[model samples]
Target: RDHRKIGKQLDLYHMQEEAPGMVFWHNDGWTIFRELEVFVRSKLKEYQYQEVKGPFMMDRVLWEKTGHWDNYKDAMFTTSSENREYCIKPMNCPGHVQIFNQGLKSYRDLPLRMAEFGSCHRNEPSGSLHGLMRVRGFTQDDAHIFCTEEQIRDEVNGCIRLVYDMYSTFGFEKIVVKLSTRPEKRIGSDEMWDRAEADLAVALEENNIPFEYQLGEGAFYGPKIEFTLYDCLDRAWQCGTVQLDFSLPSRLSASYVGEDNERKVPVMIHRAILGSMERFIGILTEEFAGFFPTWLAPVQVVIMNITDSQSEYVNELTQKLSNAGIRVKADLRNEKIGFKIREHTLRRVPYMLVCGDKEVESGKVAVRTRRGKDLGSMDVNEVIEKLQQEIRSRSLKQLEE
Candidate 1:
């Protein structure tokens, strides 16, 4: 269940001493990353989130204004130029606040959900760094919702639903929810903290979610609801959070014109379904033991030819599968058919298509699962349809047989 070992065996990604806690993703690993990004983007579209990009590094003063410099200076990576100090962003909230302040927002624009696949960096101790689970550089599936106080419940509820939907799609069912209230060194007033905590509590209760309270565990600026996913080995990983913030927008001077013609600071909800792409992928690799679902598999299928005569047929099948949006490869290395099958099975490729003279002549390809289940011979079109359906449905089964 060690993902680092699986990563090495599968050639997915690696970390070198040159760049201590950063991942060097190979072609296959990057394919999975992009596929996950596409899936999350589709969900963002469904939820009406407007995607945006912010600067990867901002001036230290900006962080100071957001109280991050004071609270997280030791963990932040800083660079100094000609009399200016800049901090590589550790989070996406402040930048999103800047975006919100760009234009004069109105009450009608309340609940503006802005999202980003934000690349962030933090300086961690070298001893603490581990594979993808703990990295100095990672991308977060982060978003900030700017809405009025009255919309907090609905927005928080929506985030809870989104979190559950995404986690379940990735085959996670046992989620432990936690509500974290104010810390001793917090920014908001007691009244604001009271309202924020109560709001998150009500939102969870409305969704019939049972949660434990983590006193003094909330972020300095807000109270939050945390979702912890229990993996196959009964390991708990905190993956999603919905935070109710009443401080940052005002600090950043983000205000919207209210219906009563008064300037009001909008509440900000910081949320993320998958906290870090690298960490989530690590969790996934261990959870599936490198046998990723068809939808998330880096190389879903591999087509191999038994003899030179069937190489052209293998190429044709590869093209057809690739055209149908399947991540596939052609293994025409002149190796023994059994040898090729063993290699790809070790690579954890979900499906393998073997071509022989007879199957080529019959215009069909023999399909086999990596688990060694032979499905006899089938037409190229039929194979394509099955793979496509499996991918679209995100079926956990390899071939639905």
Candidate 2:
């Protein structure tokens, strides 16, 4: 699809020899990721998710307790300091588990969900690194829910509801769901697997979402359900996941007192809505083909001055939009109005405000959409309202009306 051509054209990101599997996020790419991260941070806070920052590397003993040593050591990168070993974290789960270990958790904090935009590193095969789509060192929207068996049914349902809204809002009309069952040679007892699998099914069914089941596709420790969103090109990408782990807490000696005052191990639920910020931003770029929604756009509005005489008026208008917290740019490049309009439109900037002597005198703008659909001369307030509606609705596919 010449995606490389498209990405470079947009100046989103690039790779350098200094770090083979890492990315040098250029301004354009960082702008895209920053916008996405801020939106996610806001939404997660709205859902009562406490934001957290974790260490990039942890001691080797932590990995062993979490079973990552045996299963993922090949992917881990190690460092030696003070004659002690540390591993660049490949997944954020172990760190979250460590945080839960710091203090004695009670049944009252049953559904404790800890989230991080965790920086993780892996020694991924060189063959796998590709643009923003895949990277060895990246960040995840990773979280872990430490909960009792009783909280499982309700919490899973809550997650499904929220994730459904997230997918639908982000321009995904159809989603592929999969329920991966336990493998034959897994770590959990048959009874534990049976209960965990049954609870997930009930949650999915109650949410009225259709999903496919796969045999023996679960993780070594437990079962999981994965979500994939299809983009504009009819391409399927796995961007979200929720897994129920039964062995980690037992392996680390994390237990809570039950209603019976008996110590019982808490189940660990691993979840990520965007999976990885790096990967998700890549998906978002291709999803819109670099034509981001108005609010999400790096520069939402561009004001053009047809001639030097109108620069003063256009500057004033840019200030007005900025005051209202609109992301905007001003073009006084001594170019024709049509030429500036064409340039800005190709960038998928939502609104173009054109000002010449006529527009300045009339106290209006020659409003144009990214597609060059002229909305005629609009008062400044009218243009603001249009941009605000697009953002407030979070509507994708545009107001093709």
Candidate 3:
């Protein structure tokens, strides 16, 4: 299933000639984005990462210092102020290092994990641009860990666990992991590369995770382990990575006082569970074919009235469901009940509540699914508890029945 086709069919999002690789997210699309953000935020809290934000643009000098200017200048977006040049960040590592450099640090603060939903931009050839998959502007579920050499394995293991946990939560069961080594244009020395690659290799082994090697494909500053997910069509999409960088901290003057009162450069580990929020959503759209789970469905529940008498009941039920934190919508446009159900089904709403005169008199609603499964009738509070349970558990099933 093509995501662009499904997005159009469902009014999720669109990209036009005016903004070649950018998304014009409809309200429904934005709803999915917000739900994913909240899920990731919860995970970040569980992992004990301190969230931070940085400027979208910085002086060209900073990029130069971090070797991004030499390695990535052509891809960067630049602007000038007072005869000085500024480059909008193409990645979040350098800004993260600046945050890490903010104050004096001791060995006690060695394993500092700083996370950001980093917004990034890169200039890509127009012809090469595709939908969300190959966009010039995107946001990363990005983070950088400042730690000592002894902490590398533990931190990396934690990152690997996070990657797997997230992918599995999203219903991706087949994952392909790759260990990428130094590239020809890399910034680190052979000695640094040797240790970095070895550390990743050992971590993967210790975790009993099988992986393949992607030789000469690593980031300029580090070696990285990438996690790729196989979608419904068995197509692989790379979405997660954990990199071991031995150069950036020293290059950016990030140091911590050691246990022995000696100054030491901290190692930087760069990681992300979702490489690009936009692209991941694209993959998800195609994977689920726009029939998102109850937790992710833009309109989780749609309530329709069988007749004018039931319209009042439908409105009241809508409010009750909304108050219970359900994304509920009322269809009371004097349309037939069958028409409303069919419209919402095509829209891929997870649940449908059909209120008829009988249902209204009994203070109950007949529940059905977008898949056309009849879930029988239930009282208002009972249905609310059932929907809340599904949403809270992020269940992949539309309903227990």
Candidate 4:
């Protein structure tokens, strides 16, 4: 199924000429976006990356010096201020370099890993813009690692592990790895490009993984490792990537003092696991058919009242489940219990807690799952415990057993 249809059916998000290529994220969609961000942040912490924020707009001079003005002018969005020009960032690497160049450092500070949920914009032509997958503005799970040449292999290896581990969480198993070499217009000498490509190849080989070589596909400043994942439909989407950049730091004059008391440019490694959050969410939407797993579902559970008589009970139950750390909402509209159940059921909410006169009186709830399984009835405490277990364990299956 297509994500555009699912997005509207679920009321997740939309786009229009009001701001072509920009997303109008509804509450439901933003919830999923936040959940994804939190998941990525937790993993970043595990990898010891320091999170940082940078301005969304910067002086155009920076882009000019970085060669983006000459190479990527058509794609960038720019503005003028008091005769000075500025551009919304189209990428994160340049801003990250600015951060890295801010402070004096030593070799001990080598391998300083920095992360940002960078918001970027590119003037992607209107004709090419599609739903969230191809928005002109999107947030990137961007990161950079500064290290010496000797540390390149280890860093790449660690990044490989990170990428694979992350994809595993989403049930993406068929990954295509490729090594992209220097293009004709790229910076750095032939010797530097050769070493960069060789280092990444070594990392791939050490990990016991095979890859294809894509000549002349590398970024202008470096060689890179490109990872494309196959969805359930067997279509490929390029997602996680790690780029070895030897030119940016030098071009921006970012450096560190080596152990030998000599100033040297630190190699910058640009990487992203999910690439664009909007695109990744679109992929997830299509991949799971909008029935997100318990851990990732926007609304994991919904509590509904059969009549106004049980409205208070349903609200209380909603509070209890939320307190137990479940993503829940209470549906207390004046509608037939069956009508409400079918409505939320179609949304594929993971679980449905049906509260009526009988349920309130018996101090139990009738639990129905999106999988169409009736788990029978259980005490409020038991239901809460079950859901907490499922959410905490990050179970992909909707059913408990």
Error of 1 at 376 (Å): 0.8
lDDT of each: 0.91, 0.82, 0.89, 0.89
Q: Which ten-residue region of model 4 has the weakest summed lDDT?
A: 392-401
Considering TM-score, where higher is better, how would the candidates rank from best to worst? 1, 4, 3, 2
The per-prediction CA RMSD against the true structure, in angstroms, equals 1.3, 1.8, 1.7, 1.4
lDDT of model number 3: 0.89
lDDT of each residue in 9-57, candidate 1, tens digit only: 9999988999999999998888888988998999999998999999999
Clashes of 3: 0
Comparing 3 with 4 on TM-score, the higher-scoring candidate is 4
In candidate 2 the C-alpha lDDT for residue 184 amounts to 77
| Model 3: residues with Cα > 4 Å off, grouped in runs | 182-194, 216-220
Clashing pairs in 3: none
What tens digits encode model 3's per-residue C-alpha lDDT throughout 172-217?
9899999998888877678778877888999999988999999998
Model 4 regions more than 4 Å off: 184-186
Clashing pairs in 4: none
Error of 3 at 208 (Å): 1.9
- Model 1 worst lDDT run, 10 consecutive residues: 392-401
